[PDB]
């Protein structure tokens, strides 16, 4: 009894319908992947940074070494088109399982199989479908280990001199360490997962991640819900979809934070630097400029009484001065060379900058991750001229939008699902209105 | 003496929302 | 930019990634030719 | 062994100045044929005192303790300088450069916040004479230069400054301004204070000392808007000696 | 702080001379039944 | 121009339904 | 009889004067603890250093502020995004000096507003209701999360959150319209759309429906006594409220159906302040407003100003005095 | 107003002899300015170095002088510092060091001459707002 | 006995030329061969007594030297002003554009 424009409601209980729904759907998932990298390929120009160019699936491909070599440069346009082609071709084998599903196909799917078929109130059928997906999850997850580890390995933003695509020898299988990051504070300094700050740690991750998703996918298909799972759920398709939706949510805000903050699995060098990144580079810039001139940038007061150049964290660490003191958690390839263990060193400082590491933080500087929303680079009350926001400003609004509006449809569905399953999802029975057999408050 | 009418009024105003909650003219039906 | 041999089709590349959005505005063209039932 | 930066972001480590081992109670000799510099000169502050106001002028004010409210951001570190011998073999630190200064703000009791820039820019200190070894008795008594906590940019919350903002009280268009004079009129300190540094400790095998220091100085005077205070701090020092 | 020393009396009968006014009406509502 | 090929795809989805509405098919 | 149980039964039941149900159990310490910490503060509370730059800024009432003025302030710059608990300073000296008690209130705040909205959610199936309320709620929620959360965690520091302060809000207004050029925004052109006609179809909807009161009562006494609390029977006319209203526009421009009418009602405001805390959520990464400078120029090259570049004169007159003293690099980056 | 012949001639050299650019030349080195240099030089600044501008009474104080044709195309292949003292191509983008700055790759000769063109006749279209900055935006 | 020294400055020399003793670094960019190199050595070595001191500064080549006598007409020097030369404000005196 849904209106046209819930129409899609009316699948809920068509498992061939909602089977070709979610096919074709698929199939626009691969078809943008597919045509989105030939797009972002066509209008490449490897002369330019990646980021200066609105690009954000072939840093996608770079980061798991298709396609570069030292420093970033790319090296190689083939594995890019590969990967679009690739995909693109597939959207048209999901199409059409997906439209014959939707069109054709049995619009309900437990007369022509048991084993396809399924009731969303059967918990043992929906814990054996979550089973298999949940392998196949596992599978993904060891594919990238596979990558990094015997077909090539990754780029490596930390690699010694600029960046490489490194082979993953030896990745982190200390639980103590990969579950570490699960109970690191998610504040400042802290950082939960998201301050993963190398690629042995994100293999030995991605290890575990696919046995544990085995493992479970293995046991939901051979258990039912216990007893106390059975009374703390809804057990109703709506119901299982805000389940992913609220998922879904929590995932998209993480995705967020990532690209923000993580210049080790989003390499600076193709996304651009971070927000924090472009404000630290500044101070060095200046740091630079102003040493190669004669100030003593240790012993140079600034007009708050704070050090111009470099003061101390609350924890005593020396750090950037001005307002990028919020920024000194910041950790960056072209800076760590400068770091002693009491901070940032005042002997490097004056002695072992290199052009390299100057170039750098002018560079990113010029690139922090600001702009207007036609693309006009720099703080707001600049002028025309540089056509330009972040790959990161980009990945982290859209992430934002989407996981806020899923979240919102998490309590759409979750209080639909909880109403239908107690029957009063269409309104109050005039003739048994609760309130009505409720004593007064008063 | 400016802090304390400010601090009298906000006081007032949280003692008012006592008597409206718990000493409100009850809604009696029909 | 593409692979030269396949340049002849750098146009329609430039079309391609909006094809989604069209499937979207397809709904609606379907919908209105039954009357949005 | 040391310590690498991620063993000590986040636990106050970075602000506390080298130790020396207990055992070092050595002689660091000195040739006045060999020059030398301190290569590391670490000061720690643990104490931060200020003298009271006694209201009359025949009972003379304590220095009173004080809390500290700036955290673990007060060391000096990095500094350096010639350590030169002279004619009559004292020994005289001449600060050259470091970390040399921090702000602190401490708290006195009925919470009065006393800022101060805790400094030894441009430090002489001198030994006495005829040293020829530095030992666990060696005392070096300097000199320091203060400047003013803010420098010459910096904007009261008005607008008004020293080489930038407004020159009058501009929210009050018709007041008098001979009363305003002191607020309007920005002016730059610049003031001496005195430091003692006592060898505790010596590894004469590394040239490192270490030890005890005591500090006087005044505190911020807001550019002139009030009367500093007196400051006294006291804390420990680690210097690393080496051969020019 | 110099602030209006009138400003005391001022809000006093702004509160008052109001409130005094409803709590009148009130309580002669009340007492009719 | 690319607006060409953007007219030919445009018009395949009206054009499936078109031909669906006059061959009165399963709309 | 068992404990558990009829603690269960009491945290759940309808027949409280005040539901707590069990994200009241979480909501009620934790807005306690935060309007108990605000209620101090924002009396007594010592001046906080807000831009880390050792300038402490007065906030309380006992040191200098009136009800307009006063606020609690946001801590320090120089603790950026770190966690600043009470037992992670010294002293709670210490934790006044750098802005402790903002942190404490926020957490606890947000914490306990989220649990206000799925307590909004459970007693409307304890009542046997339909459960969208709680998502009407979303939107303010979400625009506080905006300002103390999401603003903060994109430019790097809780320092340039929303100040707790009538003031302060003002404050944080007027930066952020230098900094991100927020009224050139359509996030938040759609805010003001939804917000003038949130009044706007507040105030008709309420004439309407006051226009067609049916007549119950005489002269002398309030016409609200024609209309008894519960009684079956509508209290206005809809028909002649839409007779009216279609003929002050046309007939199909006027709602006949009120479940639509009140659906309206609901999603207007609702889905432009969503955009709007969205806006603020994704100018926290600096994804900004329109930049029109200079856009228009002449056929020698002269820029012909528009609107937009006096916009920008006044936009860079916040800029350039904006926390005049903590700013030693050329750049405002965050 | 418009950009006439006038406003597009500029000096070639420091010896007086000028040259007039076209339309399309000017308008191509105001493309590839914004390609190249724009990040740092918008309007006519240095963003990582504010003190040293591109008005052409600075580029004339400089040592070789670059308020003319051939002494910006110089700068853009072998950039010195201000004084002249100094060789800066590791740290500034120049034909000598397009290894290691991307973009003066593609650079061609006449690519040179288009930019340093806008460069000098920027100024005296746009006045004090060339190398000025936010004060005159 | 209320007065602002950086005012007053503005009304000796320092006002009218470069003041070697106190003038910040960027003003040497006025005139041609003066900045980086000479500006930096100029600065490090001040205070000067005479604006005539500068040629005897250590390491001048003749070049260096011939610069320093074409500019000693757009030099001055002035009572070194403790509110100029602090904070490293010679260098930076947070001045952009
Ligand atoms: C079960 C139901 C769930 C309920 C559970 C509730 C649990 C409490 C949630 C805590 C909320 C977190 C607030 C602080 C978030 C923040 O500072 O998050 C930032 C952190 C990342 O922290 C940063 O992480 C960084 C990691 O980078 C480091 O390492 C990197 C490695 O490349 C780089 O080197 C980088 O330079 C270096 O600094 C550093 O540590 C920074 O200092 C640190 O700030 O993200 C994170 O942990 C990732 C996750 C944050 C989620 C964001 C929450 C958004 C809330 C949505 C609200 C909408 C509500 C709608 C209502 C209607
Ligand atoms: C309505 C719904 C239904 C009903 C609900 C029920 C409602 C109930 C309402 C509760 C109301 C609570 C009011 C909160 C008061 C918080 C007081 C505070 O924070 O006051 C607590 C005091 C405050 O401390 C003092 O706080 C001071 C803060 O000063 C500041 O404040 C001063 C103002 O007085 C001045 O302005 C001063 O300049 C300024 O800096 C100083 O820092 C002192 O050093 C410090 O001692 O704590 C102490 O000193 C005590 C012990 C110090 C001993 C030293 C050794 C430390 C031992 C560790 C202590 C263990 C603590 C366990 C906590 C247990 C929690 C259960
Ligand atoms: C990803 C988006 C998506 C997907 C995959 C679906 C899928 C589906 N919808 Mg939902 N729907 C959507 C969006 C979507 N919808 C939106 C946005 C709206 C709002 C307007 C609706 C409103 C809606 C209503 C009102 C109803 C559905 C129904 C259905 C189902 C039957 C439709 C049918 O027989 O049409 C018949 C249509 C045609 C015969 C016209 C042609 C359609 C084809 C598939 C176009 C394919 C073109 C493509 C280029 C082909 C490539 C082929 C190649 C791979 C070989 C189907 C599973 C119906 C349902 O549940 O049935 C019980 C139903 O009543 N939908
Ligand atoms: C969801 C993730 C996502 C992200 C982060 C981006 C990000 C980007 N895209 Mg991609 N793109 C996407 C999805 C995404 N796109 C999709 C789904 C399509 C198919 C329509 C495209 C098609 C596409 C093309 C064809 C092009 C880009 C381009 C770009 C860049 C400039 C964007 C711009 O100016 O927007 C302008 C901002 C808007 C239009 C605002 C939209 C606000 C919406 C309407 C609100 C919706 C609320 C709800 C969802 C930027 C890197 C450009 C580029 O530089 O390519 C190299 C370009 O030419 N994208
Ligand atoms: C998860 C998606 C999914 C699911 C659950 C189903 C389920 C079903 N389909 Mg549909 N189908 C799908 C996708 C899906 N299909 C796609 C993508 C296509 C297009 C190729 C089709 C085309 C299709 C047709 C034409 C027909 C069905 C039929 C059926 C039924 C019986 C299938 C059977 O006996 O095969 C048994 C098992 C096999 C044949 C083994 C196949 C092994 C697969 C191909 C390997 C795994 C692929 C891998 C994940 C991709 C790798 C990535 C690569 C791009 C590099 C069943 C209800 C039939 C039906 O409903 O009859 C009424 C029928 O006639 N399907
Ligand atoms: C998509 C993934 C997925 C999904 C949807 C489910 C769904 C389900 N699982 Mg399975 N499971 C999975 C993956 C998944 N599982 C995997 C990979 C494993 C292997 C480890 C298992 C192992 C497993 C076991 C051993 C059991 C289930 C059970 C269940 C059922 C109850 C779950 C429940 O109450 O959770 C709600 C969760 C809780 C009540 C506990 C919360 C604990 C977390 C860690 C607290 C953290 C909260 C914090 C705010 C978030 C930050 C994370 C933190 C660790 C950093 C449900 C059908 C139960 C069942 O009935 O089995 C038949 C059961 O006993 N699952
Ligand atoms: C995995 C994601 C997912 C899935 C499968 C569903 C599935 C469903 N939803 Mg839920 N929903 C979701 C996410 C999801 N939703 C989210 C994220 C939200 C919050 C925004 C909601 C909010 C929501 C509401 C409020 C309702 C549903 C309803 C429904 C049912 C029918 C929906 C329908 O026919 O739409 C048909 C599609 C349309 C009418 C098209 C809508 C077009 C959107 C709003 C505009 C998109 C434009 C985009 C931003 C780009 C434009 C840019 C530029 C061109 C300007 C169906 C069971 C209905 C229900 O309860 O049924 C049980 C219902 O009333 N959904
Ligand atoms: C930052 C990464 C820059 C980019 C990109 C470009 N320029 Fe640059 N320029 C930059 C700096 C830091 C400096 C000062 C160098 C020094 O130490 O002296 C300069 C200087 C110039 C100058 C000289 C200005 C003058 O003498 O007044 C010119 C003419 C100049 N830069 C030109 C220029 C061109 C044409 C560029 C695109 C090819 C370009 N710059 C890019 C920083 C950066
Ligand atoms: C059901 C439904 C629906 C939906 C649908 C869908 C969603 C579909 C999908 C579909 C799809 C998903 C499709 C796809 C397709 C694809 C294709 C068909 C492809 C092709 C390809 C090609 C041909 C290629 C080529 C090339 C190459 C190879 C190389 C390079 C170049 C180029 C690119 C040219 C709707 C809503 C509408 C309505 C209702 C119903
Ligand atoms: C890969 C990687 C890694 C790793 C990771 C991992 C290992 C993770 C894990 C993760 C996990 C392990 C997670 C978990 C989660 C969980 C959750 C998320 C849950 C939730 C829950 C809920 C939701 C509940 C609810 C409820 C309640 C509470 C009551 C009753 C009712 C209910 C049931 C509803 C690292 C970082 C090293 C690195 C990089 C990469
Ligand atoms: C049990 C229970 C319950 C209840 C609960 C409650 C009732 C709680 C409460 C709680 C509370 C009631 C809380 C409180 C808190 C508080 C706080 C935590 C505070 C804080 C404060 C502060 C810390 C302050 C400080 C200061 C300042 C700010 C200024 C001046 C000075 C001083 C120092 C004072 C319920 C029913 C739910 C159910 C379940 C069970
Ligand atoms: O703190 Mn509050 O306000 Ca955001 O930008 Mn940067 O930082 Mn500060 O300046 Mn503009
Ligand atoms: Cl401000
Ligand atoms: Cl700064």
Redesign the pocket.
Known sequence: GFAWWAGNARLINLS?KL?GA??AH?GLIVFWAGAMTLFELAHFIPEKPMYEQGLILIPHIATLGWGVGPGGEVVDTFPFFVVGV?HLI?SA??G???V??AIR??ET?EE??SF??YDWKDKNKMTTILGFHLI?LGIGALLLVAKAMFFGGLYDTWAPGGGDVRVITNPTLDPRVIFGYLLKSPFGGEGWIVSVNNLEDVVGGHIWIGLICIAGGIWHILTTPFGWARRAFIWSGEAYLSYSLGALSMMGFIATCFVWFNNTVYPSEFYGPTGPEASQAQAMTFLIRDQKLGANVGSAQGPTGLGKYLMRSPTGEIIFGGETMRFWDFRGPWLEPLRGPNGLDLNKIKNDIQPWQERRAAEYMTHAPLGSLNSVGGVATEINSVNFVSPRSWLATSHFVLAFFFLVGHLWHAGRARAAAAGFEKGIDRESEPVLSMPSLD | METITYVFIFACIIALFFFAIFFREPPRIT | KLPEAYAIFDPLVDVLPVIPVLFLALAFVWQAAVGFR | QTLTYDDIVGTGLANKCPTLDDTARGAYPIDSSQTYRIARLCLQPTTFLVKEEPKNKRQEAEFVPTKLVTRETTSLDQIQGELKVNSDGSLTFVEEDGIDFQPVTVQMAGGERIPLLFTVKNLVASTQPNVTSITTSTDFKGEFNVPSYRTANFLDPKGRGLASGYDSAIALPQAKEEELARANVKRFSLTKGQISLNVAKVDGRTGEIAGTFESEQLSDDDMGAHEPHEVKIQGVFYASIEPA | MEVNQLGLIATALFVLVPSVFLIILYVQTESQQ | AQLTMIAMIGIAGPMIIFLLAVRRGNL | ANLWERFCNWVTSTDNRLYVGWFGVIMIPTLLAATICFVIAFIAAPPVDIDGIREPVSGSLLYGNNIITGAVVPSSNAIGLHFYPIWEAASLDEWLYNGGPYQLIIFHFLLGASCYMGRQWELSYRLGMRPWICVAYSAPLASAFAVFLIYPIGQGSFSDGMPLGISGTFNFMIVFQAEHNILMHPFHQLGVAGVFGGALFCAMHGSLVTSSLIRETTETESANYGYKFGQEEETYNIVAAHGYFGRLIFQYASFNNSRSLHFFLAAWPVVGVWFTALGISTMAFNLNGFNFNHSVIDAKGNVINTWADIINRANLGMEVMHERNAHNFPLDLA | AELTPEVLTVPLNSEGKTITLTEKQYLEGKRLFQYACASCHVGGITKTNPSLDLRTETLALATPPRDNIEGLVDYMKNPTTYDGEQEIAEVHPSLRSADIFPKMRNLTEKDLVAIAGHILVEPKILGDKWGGGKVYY | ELVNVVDEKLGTAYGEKIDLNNTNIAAFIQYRGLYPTLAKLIVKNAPYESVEDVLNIPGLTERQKQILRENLEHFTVTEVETALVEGGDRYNNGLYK
Do not use: I, K, N, Q
Request: proline share 5%; glycine share 22%; aromatic share 18%.
């Open positions: 061939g089977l979610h096919v698929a690739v597939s084998v999901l059409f399982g997906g014959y599903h196909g049995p799917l022509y199989s396809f078929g196949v």
